[PDB]
mmCIF file of C-alpha atoms in Angstrom:
data_model
loop_
_atom_site.group_PDB
_atom_site.id
_atom_site.type_symbol
_atom_site.label_atom_id
_atom_site.label_comp_id
_atom_site.label_asym_id
_atom_site.label_seq_id
_atom_site.Cartn_x
_atom_site.Cartn_y
_atom_site.Cartn_z
ATOM 1 C CA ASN A 1 -90.434 96.240 6.267
ATOM 2 C CA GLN A 2 -91.761 95.415 9.757
ATOM 3 C CA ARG A 3 -94.937 93.387 9.199
ATOM 4 C CA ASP A 4 -96.737 92.425 12.417
ATOM 5 C CA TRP A 5 -98.149 88.888 12.349
ATOM 6 C CA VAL A 6 -100.756 88.146 15.026
ATOM 7 C CA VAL A 7 -100.358 84.373 15.102
ATOM 8 C CA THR A 8 -103.024 82.210 16.735
ATOM 9 C CA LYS A 9 -100.900 81.093 19.709
ATOM 10 C CA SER A 10 -98.174 83.692 20.364
ATOM 11 C CA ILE A 11 -97.090 87.288 19.901
ATOM 12 C CA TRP A 12 -94.906 87.449 16.770
ATOM 13 C CA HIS A 13 -93.846 90.232 14.435
ATOM 14 C CA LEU A 14 -90.947 90.278 12.004
ATOM 15 C CA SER A 15 -88.693 92.439 9.840
ATOM 16 C CA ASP A 16 -86.659 91.271 6.847
ATOM 17 C CA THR A 17 -84.516 92.613 4.012
ATOM 18 C CA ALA A 18 -82.760 91.318 0.902
ATOM 19 C CA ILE A 19 -79.000 91.697 0.431
ATOM 20 C CA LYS A 20 -76.413 90.363 -2.013
ATOM 21 C CA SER A 21 -72.880 91.317 -3.022
ATOM 22 C CA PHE A 22 -73.512 93.633 -5.957
ATOM 23 C CA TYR A 23 -70.515 92.826 -8.157
ATOM 24 C CA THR A 24 -67.692 92.395 -5.614
ATOM 25 C CA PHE A 25 -67.777 88.760 -6.719
ATOM 26 C CA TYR A 26 -65.125 90.159 -9.071
ATOM 27 C CA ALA A 27 -63.117 91.864 -6.323
ATOM 28 C CA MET A 28 -63.012 88.728 -4.170
ATOM 29 C CA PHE A 29 -61.693 86.697 -7.100
ATOM 30 C CA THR A 30 -59.133 89.443 -7.682
ATOM 31 C CA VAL A 31 -58.055 89.237 -4.027
ATOM 32 C CA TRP A 32 -57.938 85.441 -4.322
ATOM 33 C CA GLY A 33 -55.527 86.207 -7.084
ATOM 34 C CA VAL A 34 -53.136 85.779 -4.166
ATOM 35 C CA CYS A 35 -52.121 82.417 -5.609
ATOM 36 C CA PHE A 36 -49.543 84.601 -7.343
ATOM 37 C CA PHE A 37 -48.094 84.641 -3.807
ATOM 38 C CA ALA A 38 -47.576 80.852 -3.975
ATOM 39 C CA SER A 39 -43.913 81.516 -4.727
ATOM 40 C CA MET A 40 -42.680 82.554 -1.276
ATOM 41 C CA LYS A 41 -44.128 79.375 0.256
ATOM 42 C CA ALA A 42 -42.440 77.213 -2.398
ATOM 43 C CA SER A 43 -38.868 78.523 -2.288
ATOM 44 C CA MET A 44 -38.901 77.620 1.405
ATOM 45 C CA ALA A 45 -36.970 74.537 2.461
ATOM 46 C CA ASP A 46 -38.535 71.172 1.816
ATOM 47 C CA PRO A 47 -39.327 69.147 4.946
ATOM 48 C CA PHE A 48 -37.645 65.880 3.987
ATOM 49 C CA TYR A 49 -38.005 65.521 0.191
ATOM 50 C CA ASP A 50 -34.425 66.859 0.163
ATOM 51 C CA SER A 51 -33.337 65.062 3.351
ATOM 52 C CA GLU A 52 -30.465 62.586 3.319
ATOM 53 C CA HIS A 53 -32.959 59.896 4.367
ATOM 54 C CA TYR A 54 -34.324 59.929 0.812
ATOM 55 C CA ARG A 55 -33.017 58.760 -2.566
ATOM 56 C CA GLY A 56 -35.254 57.845 -5.459
ATOM 57 C CA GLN A 57 -37.837 60.395 -6.560
ATOM 58 C CA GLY A 58 -40.646 58.683 -8.498
ATOM 59 C CA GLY A 59 -44.043 57.706 -7.178
ATOM 60 C CA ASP A 60 -43.004 54.113 -6.626
ATOM 61 C CA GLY A 61 -39.203 54.377 -6.828
ATOM 62 C CA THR A 62 -38.147 54.399 -3.176
ATOM 63 C CA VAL A 63 -40.986 52.015 -2.316
ATOM 64 C CA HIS A 64 -40.537 49.511 -5.161
ATOM 65 C CA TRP A 65 -36.894 50.024 -6.100
ATOM 66 C CA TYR A 66 -36.595 46.743 -4.238
ATOM 67 C CA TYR A 67 -34.711 44.728 -6.836
ATOM 68 C CA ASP A 68 -31.246 44.841 -5.389
ATOM 69 C CA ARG A 69 -32.301 41.228 -4.760
ATOM 70 C CA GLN A 70 -31.501 40.432 -8.399
ATOM 71 C CA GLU A 71 -28.184 42.263 -8.109
ATOM 72 C CA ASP A 72 -27.510 40.311 -4.910
ATOM 73 C CA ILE A 73 -28.193 36.994 -6.647
ATOM 74 C CA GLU A 74 -25.762 38.135 -9.346
ATOM 75 C CA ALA A 75 -23.181 39.050 -6.696
ATOM 76 C CA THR A 76 -23.713 35.571 -5.242
ATOM 77 C CA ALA A 77 -22.991 34.059 -8.658
ATOM 78 C CA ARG A 78 -19.852 36.202 -8.901
ATOM 79 C CA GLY A 79 -18.671 35.180 -5.433
ATOM 80 C CA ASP A 80 -19.225 31.565 -6.442
ATOM 81 C CA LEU A 81 -17.064 32.289 -9.489
ATOM 82 C CA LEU A 82 -14.404 33.509 -7.032
ATOM 83 C CA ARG B 1 -32.975 33.676 -24.643
ATOM 84 C CA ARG B 2 -35.413 34.144 -21.751
ATOM 85 C CA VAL B 3 -37.017 31.336 -19.742
ATOM 86 C CA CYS B 4 -39.818 31.290 -17.162
ATOM 87 C CA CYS B 5 -40.510 28.548 -14.625
ATOM 88 C CA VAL B 6 -43.932 28.230 -13.006
ATOM 89 C CA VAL B 7 -43.038 25.777 -10.232
ATOM 90 C CA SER B 8 -45.856 25.244 -7.730
ATOM 91 C CA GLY B 9 -46.063 24.371 -4.057
ATOM 92 C CA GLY B 10 -44.323 25.515 -0.916
ATOM 93 C CA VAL B 11 -40.702 24.981 0.141
ATOM 94 C CA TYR B 12 -39.704 21.304 0.186
ATOM 95 C CA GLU B 13 -41.176 20.759 -3.297
ATOM 96 C CA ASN B 14 -39.487 23.948 -4.546
ATOM 97 C CA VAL B 15 -36.011 23.607 -3.056
ATOM 98 C CA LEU B 16 -35.707 20.480 -5.225
ATOM 99 C CA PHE B 17 -36.190 22.665 -8.320
ATOM 100 C CA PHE B 18 -32.606 23.958 -8.197
ATOM 101 C CA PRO B 19 -31.261 21.054 -10.336
ATOM 102 C CA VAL B 20 -33.663 21.994 -13.143
ATOM 103 C CA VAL B 21 -32.622 25.654 -12.989
ATOM 104 C CA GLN B 22 -28.943 24.700 -13.067
ATOM 105 C CA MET B 23 -29.546 22.366 -16.014
ATOM 106 C CA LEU B 24 -31.252 25.245 -17.824
ATOM 107 C CA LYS B 25 -28.388 27.654 -17.151
ATOM 108 C CA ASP B 26 -25.964 24.905 -18.240
ATOM 109 C CA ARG B 27 -27.550 23.691 -21.489
ATOM 110 C CA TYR B 28 -28.351 27.134 -22.877
ATOM 111 C CA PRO B 29 -25.599 29.420 -21.544
ATOM 112 C CA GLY B 30 -26.309 33.024 -20.641
ATOM 113 C CA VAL B 31 -30.073 32.606 -20.236
ATOM 114 C CA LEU B 32 -32.166 34.861 -18.010
ATOM 115 C CA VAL B 33 -34.484 32.479 -16.152
ATOM 116 C CA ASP B 34 -37.249 33.899 -13.961
ATOM 117 C CA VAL B 35 -39.663 31.993 -11.740
ATOM 118 C CA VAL B 36 -43.203 32.393 -10.395
ATOM 119 C CA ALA B 37 -44.266 30.433 -7.317
ATOM 120 C CA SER B 38 -46.311 30.734 -4.122
ATOM 121 C CA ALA B 39 -45.662 33.203 -1.312
ATOM 122 C CA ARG B 40 -44.344 30.477 0.983
ATOM 123 C CA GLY B 41 -42.216 29.125 -1.870
ATOM 124 C CA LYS B 42 -40.672 32.314 -3.243
ATOM 125 C CA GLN B 43 -38.887 32.598 0.123
ATOM 126 C CA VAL B 44 -36.514 29.844 -1.029
ATOM 127 C CA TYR B 45 -35.119 31.784 -4.005
ATOM 128 C CA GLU B 46 -33.201 34.187 -1.734
ATOM 129 C CA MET B 47 -30.265 31.729 -1.854
ATOM 130 C CA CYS B 48 -29.304 30.948 -5.461
ATOM 131 C CA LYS B 49 -27.021 32.107 -8.270
ATOM 132 C CA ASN B 50 -29.087 31.566 -11.445
ATOM 133 C CA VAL B 51 -32.555 33.141 -11.277
ATOM 134 C CA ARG B 52 -32.890 36.807 -12.212
ATOM 135 C CA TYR B 53 -35.814 37.704 -9.953
ATOM 136 C CA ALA B 54 -38.680 35.630 -8.573
ATOM 137 C CA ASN B 55 -42.383 36.486 -8.262
ATOM 138 C CA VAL B 56 -45.560 35.246 -6.593
ATOM 139 C CA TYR B 57 -48.876 34.529 -8.302
ATOM 140 C CA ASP B 58 -50.070 30.942 -7.934
ATOM 141 C CA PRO B 59 -51.013 29.107 -4.825
ATOM 142 C CA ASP B 60 -53.300 27.940 -7.666
ATOM 143 C CA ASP B 61 -56.674 28.869 -6.207
ATOM 144 C CA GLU B 62 -60.044 28.310 -7.911
ATOM 145 C CA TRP B 63 -61.715 31.732 -8.256
ATOM 146 C CA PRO B 64 -58.886 34.211 -8.292
ATOM 147 C CA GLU B 65 -60.554 37.468 -9.217
ATOM 148 C CA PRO B 66 -60.327 38.337 -12.951
ATOM 149 C CA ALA B 67 -58.123 41.378 -12.525
ATOM 150 C CA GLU B 68 -55.261 39.748 -10.630
ATOM 151 C CA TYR B 69 -55.583 37.082 -13.335
ATOM 152 C CA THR B 70 -55.134 39.395 -16.330
ATOM 153 C CA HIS B 71 -52.380 41.474 -14.711
ATOM 154 C CA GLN B 72 -50.423 38.272 -14.077
ATOM 155 C CA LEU B 73 -50.786 37.326 -17.731
ATOM 156 C CA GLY B 74 -50.111 41.016 -18.386
ATOM 157 C CA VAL B 75 -46.669 40.626 -16.817
ATOM 158 C CA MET B 76 -45.751 37.185 -18.163
ATOM 159 C CA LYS B 77 -46.553 38.193 -21.743
ATOM 160 C CA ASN B 78 -44.962 41.644 -21.745
ATOM 161 C CA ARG B 79 -41.440 40.340 -21.317
ATOM 162 C CA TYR B 80 -41.422 37.835 -24.217
ATOM 163 C CA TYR B 81 -40.306 34.539 -22.746
ATOM 164 C CA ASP B 82 -39.276 31.725 -25.089
ATOM 165 C CA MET B 83 -39.893 28.419 -23.266
ATOM 166 C CA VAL B 84 -42.259 28.697 -20.289
ATOM 167 C CA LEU B 85 -41.686 25.305 -18.678
ATOM 168 C CA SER B 86 -44.260 24.580 -16.000
ATOM 169 C CA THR B 87 -45.455 22.290 -13.217
ATOM 170 C CA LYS B 88 -48.724 22.029 -11.208
ATOM 171 C CA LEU B 89 -50.087 19.401 -13.627
ATOM 172 C CA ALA B 90 -52.033 21.474 -16.119
ATOM 173 C CA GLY B 91 -55.272 19.991 -17.397
ATOM 174 C CA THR B 92 -57.220 21.915 -20.026
ATOM 175 C CA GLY B 93 -57.801 25.207 -18.191
ATOM 176 C CA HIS B 94 -54.317 25.912 -16.866
ATOM 177 C CA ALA B 95 -52.935 24.964 -20.287
ATOM 178 C CA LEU B 96 -54.582 28.089 -21.714
ATOM 179 C CA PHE B 97 -52.725 30.213 -19.155
ATOM 180 C CA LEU B 98 -49.443 28.895 -20.552
ATOM 181 C CA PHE B 99 -50.693 29.159 -24.135
ATOM 182 C CA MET B 100 -51.710 32.833 -24.015
ATOM 183 C CA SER B 101 -48.137 33.612 -22.930
ATOM 184 C CA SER B 102 -46.976 33.812 -26.529
ATOM 185 C CA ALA B 103 -43.721 31.887 -26.146
ATOM 186 C CA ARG B 104 -42.245 29.264 -28.482
ATOM 187 C CA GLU B 105 -41.974 26.008 -26.496
ATOM 188 C CA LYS B 106 -44.570 25.213 -23.810
ATOM 189 C CA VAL B 107 -43.547 22.122 -21.823
ATOM 190 C CA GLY B 108 -45.236 20.931 -18.659
ATOM 191 C CA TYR B 109 -46.902 18.156 -16.695
ATOM 192 C CA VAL B 110 -50.472 16.875 -17.085
ATOM 193 C CA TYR B 111 -53.045 14.725 -15.284
ATOM 194 C CA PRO B 112 -53.106 11.038 -16.314
ATOM 195 C CA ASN B 113 -56.883 10.556 -16.339
ATOM 196 C CA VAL B 114 -58.407 12.548 -13.475
ATOM 197 C CA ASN B 115 -59.558 16.189 -13.414
ATOM 198 C CA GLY B 116 -60.352 16.274 -17.112
ATOM 199 C CA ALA B 117 -57.408 14.285 -18.489
ATOM 200 C CA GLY B 118 -57.267 16.532 -21.523
ATOM 201 C CA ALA B 119 -53.724 17.948 -21.821
ATOM 202 C CA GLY B 120 -54.850 19.970 -24.862
ATOM 203 C CA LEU B 121 -53.350 20.233 -28.321
ATOM 204 C CA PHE B 122 -51.672 23.592 -27.578
ATOM 205 C CA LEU B 123 -48.761 22.181 -25.579
ATOM 206 C CA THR B 124 -45.550 20.188 -26.018
ATOM 207 C CA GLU B 125 -44.063 17.215 -24.146
ATOM 208 C CA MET B 126 -46.811 16.433 -21.658
ATOM 209 C CA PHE B 127 -45.910 13.567 -19.363
ATOM 210 C CA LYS B 128 -46.093 11.479 -16.171
ATOM 211 C CA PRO B 129 -48.576 11.294 -13.215
ATOM 212 C CA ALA B 130 -49.537 14.100 -10.909
ATOM 213 C CA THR B 131 -49.089 14.024 -7.153
ATOM 214 C CA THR B 132 -45.275 14.375 -7.427
ATOM 215 C CA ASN B 133 -44.234 12.107 -4.577
ATOM 216 C CA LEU B 134 -40.553 11.236 -4.868
ATOM 217 C CA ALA B 135 -37.749 13.668 -4.032
ATOM 218 C CA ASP B 136 -34.566 14.129 -6.096
ATOM 219 C CA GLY B 137 -36.426 12.143 -8.690
ATOM 220 C CA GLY B 138 -39.007 14.885 -8.638
ATOM 221 C CA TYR B 139 -39.290 16.506 -12.048
ATOM 222 C CA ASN B 140 -37.536 13.424 -13.467
ATOM 223 C CA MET B 141 -39.092 14.008 -16.890
ATOM 224 C CA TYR B 142 -37.454 17.444 -17.099
ATOM 225 C CA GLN B 143 -33.909 16.196 -16.552
ATOM 226 C CA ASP B 144 -34.418 14.022 -19.650
ATOM 227 C CA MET B 145 -36.261 16.302 -22.087
ATOM 228 C CA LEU B 146 -33.564 18.973 -21.602
ATOM 229 C CA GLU B 147 -30.781 16.424 -22.244
ATOM 230 C CA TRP B 148 -29.282 16.325 -25.748
ATOM 231 C CA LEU B 149 -32.751 16.232 -27.324
ATOM 232 C CA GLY B 150 -31.665 18.436 -30.225
ATOM 233 C CA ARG B 151 -28.244 18.696 -31.729
ATOM 234 C CA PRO B 152 -24.388 18.325 -31.840
ATOM 235 C CA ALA B 153 -24.472 19.554 -28.249
ATOM 236 C CA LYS B 154 -22.541 16.848 -26.429
ATOM 237 C CA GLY B 155 -24.089 13.576 -25.280
ATOM 238 C CA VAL B 156 -26.615 14.075 -22.529
ATOM 239 C CA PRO B 157 -25.220 17.268 -21.005
ATOM 240 C CA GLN B 158 -24.169 16.092 -17.545
ATOM 241 C CA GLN B 159 -27.168 13.912 -16.633
ATOM 242 C CA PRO B 160 -28.907 15.352 -13.499
ATOM 243 C CA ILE B 161 -26.764 18.295 -12.627
ATOM 244 C CA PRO B 162 -24.949 17.900 -9.260
ATOM 245 C CA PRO B 163 -27.450 17.687 -6.389
ATOM 246 C CA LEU B 164 -28.586 20.714 -4.408
ATOM 247 C CA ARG B 165 -25.710 23.201 -4.283
ATOM 248 C CA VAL B 166 -27.372 26.199 -2.676
ATOM 249 C CA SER B 167 -25.073 29.123 -1.904
ATOM 250 C CA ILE B 168 -25.208 31.607 0.971
ATOM 251 C CA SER B 169 -24.545 35.328 0.639
ATOM 252 C CA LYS B 170 -21.875 36.374 3.128
ATOM 253 C CA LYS B 171 -24.016 39.305 4.309
ATOM 254 C CA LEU B 172 -26.870 37.057 5.430
ATOM 255 C CA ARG B 173 -24.216 34.480 6.330
ATOM 256 C CA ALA B 174 -22.688 36.829 8.898
ATOM 257 C CA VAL B 175 -25.107 39.367 10.300
ATOM 258 C CA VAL B 176 -28.470 37.652 10.825
ATOM 259 C CA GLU B 177 -26.965 34.228 11.535
ATOM 260 C CA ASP B 178 -24.744 35.768 14.221
ATOM 261 C CA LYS B 179 -27.500 37.905 15.751
ATOM 262 C CA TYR B 180 -29.917 34.983 16.054
ATOM 263 C CA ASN B 181 -27.202 32.533 17.138
ATOM 264 C CA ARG B 182 -25.813 34.664 19.969
ATOM 265 C CA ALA B 183 -29.357 35.359 21.163
ATOM 266 C CA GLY B 184 -28.901 32.576 23.660
ATOM 267 C CA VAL B 185 -26.101 30.048 23.632
ATOM 268 C CA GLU B 186 -23.853 30.018 20.560
ATOM 269 C CA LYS B 187 -20.433 28.645 19.627
ATOM 270 C CA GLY B 188 -20.904 27.310 16.111
ATOM 271 C CA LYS B 189 -20.725 23.925 17.872
ATOM 272 C CA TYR B 190 -24.396 23.022 18.339
ATOM 273 C CA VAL B 191 -27.034 20.720 16.826
ATOM 274 C CA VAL B 192 -30.256 21.714 15.064
ATOM 275 C CA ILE B 193 -33.542 19.893 15.710
ATOM 276 C CA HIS B 194 -36.403 20.728 13.359
ATOM 277 C CA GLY B 195 -39.505 18.527 13.517
ATOM 278 C CA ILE B 196 -41.489 19.764 16.515
ATOM 279 C CA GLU B 197 -45.123 20.626 15.767
ATOM 280 C CA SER B 198 -47.475 21.527 12.913
ATOM 281 C CA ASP B 199 -48.125 25.034 11.641
ATOM 282 C CA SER B 200 -46.038 25.609 8.478
ATOM 283 C CA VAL B 201 -42.579 24.230 9.229
ATOM 284 C CA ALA B 202 -41.882 22.612 5.860
ATOM 285 C CA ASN B 203 -44.621 19.941 5.725
ATOM 286 C CA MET B 204 -42.886 18.555 2.609
ATOM 287 C CA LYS B 205 -46.158 18.572 0.607
ATOM 288 C CA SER B 206 -45.656 14.828 0.034
ATOM 289 C CA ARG B 207 -44.884 12.936 3.267
ATOM 290 C CA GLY B 208 -48.578 12.900 4.162
ATOM 291 C CA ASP B 209 -48.829 11.244 7.577
ATOM 292 C CA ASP B 210 -45.429 10.934 9.264
ATOM 293 C CA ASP B 211 -42.575 13.477 9.554
ATOM 294 C CA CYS B 212 -45.069 16.234 10.413
ATOM 295 C CA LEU B 213 -43.902 16.245 14.039
ATOM 296 C CA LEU B 214 -42.751 14.194 16.992
ATOM 297 C CA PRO B 215 -44.516 14.369 20.375
ATOM 298 C CA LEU B 216 -41.583 16.408 21.754
ATOM 299 C CA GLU B 217 -40.955 13.666 24.318
ATOM 300 C CA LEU B 218 -38.655 11.713 22.013
ATOM 301 C CA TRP B 219 -36.953 15.047 21.346
ATOM 302 C CA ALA B 220 -36.376 15.583 25.072
ATOM 303 C CA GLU B 221 -35.024 12.050 25.483
ATOM 304 C CA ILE B 222 -32.667 12.639 22.556
ATOM 305 C CA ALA B 223 -31.538 16.092 23.691
ATOM 306 C CA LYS B 224 -30.746 15.080 27.274
ATOM 307 C CA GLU B 225 -27.843 12.981 25.938
ATOM 308 C CA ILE B 226 -26.895 15.307 23.070
ATOM 309 C CA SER B 227 -24.926 17.850 25.095
ATOM 310 C CA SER B 228 -24.053 15.084 27.589
ATOM 311 C CA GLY B 229 -20.333 14.761 26.938
ATOM 312 C CA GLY B 230 -17.793 17.306 25.746
ATOM 313 C CA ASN B 231 -18.656 16.515 22.130
ATOM 314 C CA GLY B 232 -20.777 19.616 21.650
ATOM 315 C CA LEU B 233 -21.778 20.613 25.199
ATOM 316 C CA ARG B 234 -23.466 23.605 23.539
ATOM 317 C CA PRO B 235 -26.412 22.102 21.668
ATOM 318 C CA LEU B 236 -29.852 22.741 23.059
ATOM 319 C CA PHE B 237 -31.443 24.124 19.874
ATOM 320 C CA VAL B 238 -34.966 22.753 19.621
ATOM 321 C CA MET B 239 -35.179 25.154 16.630
ATOM 322 C CA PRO B 240 -38.991 25.504 16.526
ATOM 323 C CA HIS B 241 -40.155 26.710 13.114
ATOM 324 C CA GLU B 242 -43.639 27.538 14.353
ATOM 325 C CA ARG B 243 -45.459 30.279 16.235
ATOM 326 C CA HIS B 244 -43.367 28.828 19.042
ATOM 327 C CA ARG B 245 -44.089 31.813 21.249
ATOM 328 C CA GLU B 246 -47.224 29.640 21.442
ATOM 329 C CA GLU B 247 -44.990 26.590 22.123
ATOM 330 C CA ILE B 248 -41.828 27.761 23.935
ATOM 331 C CA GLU B 249 -43.849 27.901 27.148
ATOM 332 C CA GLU B 250 -44.333 24.108 26.866
ATOM 333 C CA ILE B 251 -40.823 22.886 26.037
ATOM 334 C CA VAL B 252 -40.912 19.753 28.209
ATOM 335 C CA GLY B 253 -37.433 19.369 26.832
ATOM 336 C CA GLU B 254 -37.005 21.269 30.037
ATOM 337 C CA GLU B 255 -37.022 25.045 29.475
ATOM 338 C CA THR B 256 -33.908 25.411 31.669
ATOM 339 C CA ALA B 257 -31.590 26.042 28.716
ATOM 340 C CA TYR B 258 -33.360 24.717 25.589
ATOM 341 C CA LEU B 259 -32.918 27.662 23.226
ATOM 342 C CA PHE B 260 -35.206 28.572 20.341
ATOM 343 C CA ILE B 261 -35.349 30.757 17.220
ATOM 344 C CA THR B 262 -37.941 31.920 14.689
ATOM 345 C CA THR B 263 -36.897 31.620 11.054
ATOM 346 C CA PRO B 264 -38.096 31.781 7.463
ATOM 347 C CA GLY B 265 -36.664 29.302 4.957
ATOM 348 C CA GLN B 266 -33.379 31.161 5.541
ATOM 349 C CA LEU B 267 -32.127 28.570 8.066
ATOM 350 C CA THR B 268 -29.622 27.226 5.527
ATOM 351 C CA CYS B 269 -26.954 29.456 7.069
ATOM 352 C CA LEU B 270 -27.943 28.355 10.570
ATOM 353 C CA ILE B 271 -27.389 24.777 9.404
ATOM 354 C CA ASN B 272 -24.043 25.796 7.891
ATOM 355 C CA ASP B 273 -22.987 27.233 11.271
ATOM 356 C CA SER B 274 -24.058 24.190 13.302
ATOM 357 C CA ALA B 275 -22.019 21.080 14.129
ATOM 358 C CA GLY B 276 -24.616 18.766 12.596
ATOM 359 C CA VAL B 277 -28.383 18.354 12.536
ATOM 360 C CA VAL B 278 -30.939 15.703 13.543
ATOM 361 C CA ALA B 279 -34.417 15.960 12.050
ATOM 362 C CA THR B 280 -37.233 14.071 10.379
ATOM 363 C CA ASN B 281 -37.993 14.085 6.653
ATOM 364 C CA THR B 282 -38.195 17.826 5.987
ATOM 365 C CA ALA B 283 -36.427 20.664 4.186
ATOM 366 C CA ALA B 284 -33.622 20.444 6.759
ATOM 367 C CA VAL B 285 -32.645 17.039 5.345
ATOM 368 C CA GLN B 286 -32.070 18.289 1.800
ATOM 369 C CA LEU B 287 -30.518 21.549 3.001
ATOM 370 C CA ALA B 288 -27.989 19.797 5.244
ATOM 371 C CA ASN B 289 -27.223 17.160 2.606
ATOM 372 C CA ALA B 290 -26.630 19.933 0.056
ATOM 373 C CA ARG B 291 -23.597 21.119 2.003
ATOM 374 C CA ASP B 292 -21.397 18.663 3.881
ATOM 375 C CA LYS B 293 -23.185 19.263 7.217
ATOM 376 C CA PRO B 294 -23.421 15.673 8.560
ATOM 377 C CA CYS B 295 -27.149 15.121 9.087
ATOM 378 C CA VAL B 296 -29.283 12.477 10.787
ATOM 379 C CA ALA B 297 -32.630 11.896 9.065
ATOM 380 C CA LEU B 298 -35.432 10.094 10.918
ATOM 381 C CA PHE B 299 -38.468 9.415 8.734
ATOM 382 C CA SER B 300 -40.968 6.580 8.793
ATOM 383 C CA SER B 301 -39.435 3.672 6.851
ATOM 384 C CA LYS B 302 -38.048 2.733 3.434
ATOM 385 C CA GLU B 303 -39.096 6.120 2.037
ATOM 386 C CA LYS B 304 -35.370 6.807 1.558
ATOM 387 C CA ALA B 305 -35.572 5.640 -2.066
ATOM 388 C CA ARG B 306 -38.202 8.384 -2.558
ATOM 389 C CA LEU B 307 -37.058 11.299 -0.380
ATOM 390 C CA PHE B 308 -33.293 10.621 -0.088
ATOM 391 C CA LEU B 309 -31.587 9.356 -3.246
ATOM 392 C CA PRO B 310 -27.932 10.218 -2.403
ATOM 393 C CA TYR B 311 -27.766 7.583 0.346
ATOM 394 C CA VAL B 312 -24.011 8.234 0.469
ATOM 395 C CA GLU B 313 -23.875 12.029 0.441
ATOM 396 C CA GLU B 314 -20.153 12.496 1.098
ATOM 397 C CA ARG B 315 -18.949 9.574 3.258
ATOM 398 C CA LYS B 316 -22.318 8.044 4.060
ATOM 399 C CA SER B 317 -22.276 11.008 6.439
ATOM 400 C CA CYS B 318 -26.025 11.602 6.367
ATOM 401 C CA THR B 319 -27.435 8.434 7.942
ATOM 402 C CA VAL B 320 -31.088 7.384 8.066
ATOM 403 C CA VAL B 321 -32.992 5.393 10.695
ATOM 404 C CA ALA B 322 -36.340 3.830 9.794
ATOM 405 C CA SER B 323 -39.203 2.586 11.997
ATOM 406 C CA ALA B 324 -40.088 -1.110 11.876
ATOM 407 C CA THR B 325 -43.632 -0.269 12.996
ATOM 408 C CA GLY B 326 -43.924 2.138 10.051
ATOM 409 C CA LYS B 327 -45.238 5.027 12.161
ATOM 410 C CA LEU B 328 -42.603 7.694 12.758
ATOM 411 C CA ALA B 329 -43.497 8.151 16.412
ATOM 412 C CA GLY B 330 -41.991 4.813 17.291
ATOM 413 C CA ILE B 331 -38.266 4.220 16.799
ATOM 414 C CA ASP B 332 -35.285 2.664 18.547
ATOM 415 C CA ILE B 333 -34.571 6.084 20.030
ATOM 416 C CA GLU B 334 -31.799 4.376 21.998
ATOM 417 C CA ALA B 335 -29.960 3.369 18.821
ATOM 418 C CA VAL B 336 -30.838 6.816 17.453
ATOM 419 C CA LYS B 337 -28.954 8.476 20.313
ATOM 420 C CA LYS B 338 -26.180 5.908 19.832
ATOM 421 C CA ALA B 339 -25.741 7.019 16.221
ATOM 422 C CA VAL B 340 -26.035 10.709 17.110
ATOM 423 C CA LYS B 341 -23.494 10.650 19.958
ATOM 424 C CA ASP B 342 -20.551 10.243 17.565
ATOM 425 C CA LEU B 343 -20.852 13.567 15.716
#
């Protein structure tokens, strides 16, 4: 309503009301069933995960492949055998 | 058969470990031998032909937090070594670190009396005193325990494998050596000078007082008559293995044309592309004496029998000058330049 508070230092009066989405909390979840549209933004090109400046695909592969050092020591042994 | 070495220390006390590795790969043929060392030491294993792949755990601190401890054990154990031969002079605490690595034959060094003499029951072939002074004697126990100890294998299998025979990969031999050489003067006809100042050059872990540096005045006096004469006529390579961007501005070996480079323990190639080398007792001595590379070693006095066993390297090429006063920073620098002027 429009209750009229006569406060002891000023000239107030107010008006309030209660509102809440009745059941459209279902309809908004249905609309957010747009994750079924997560397929057009996945078939798009990958930025660099397919770029030529990338080989090795794990979570530590490219970073910690890093043991061509052993193969290089072996190549050194082979060159010494030559 | 798999083998793990736990050699400790930096560079100069780790470059001398190559004979042991070669003796391993010679006695038991076709053995994968890995190594764990310190960060400054692992840098040396980038020029070898035996080790499979190095690692870095032990500067051998006191606390190291008990998750980097377990994980280290958790990577030694889960590859099933057979004989984890060690150094660093295990007492009774570090012996457990070898023991929990469930191998077959645990051989290492131990403290004579100090630091809890101990040596434990759970070991094998514990031996001689600790501070590991002499060079090319070094692990002298190891080159005897791995010699014919067991079986019809021939009489002691080539007692102390040929001295340091480090190899250089032609990729590093060409590209980085050339790039750093030609940055400044370069003809492959120069002379390397190593001992300058004190940050982490090699420090040798054993020389103690001398060979750490010269006051850079003796170096200037030497260098002014190095290129004097058509012998080299290239060499002004003060070769400062320091933060020398903190030192190059004070090369009183006048900065006119005294070149300079920054290097890790990779300088073996730079030695191999020089026309000689003149340095104090440091890694450069052993590296140059490994190849032909006629060197000139200038350490304090009479320490030769400790730090330089192959007095005659190839033709008595590598020559040594002592100091009658005993302190390195006093020498017949005149006779030094006399000896150097021939090469």
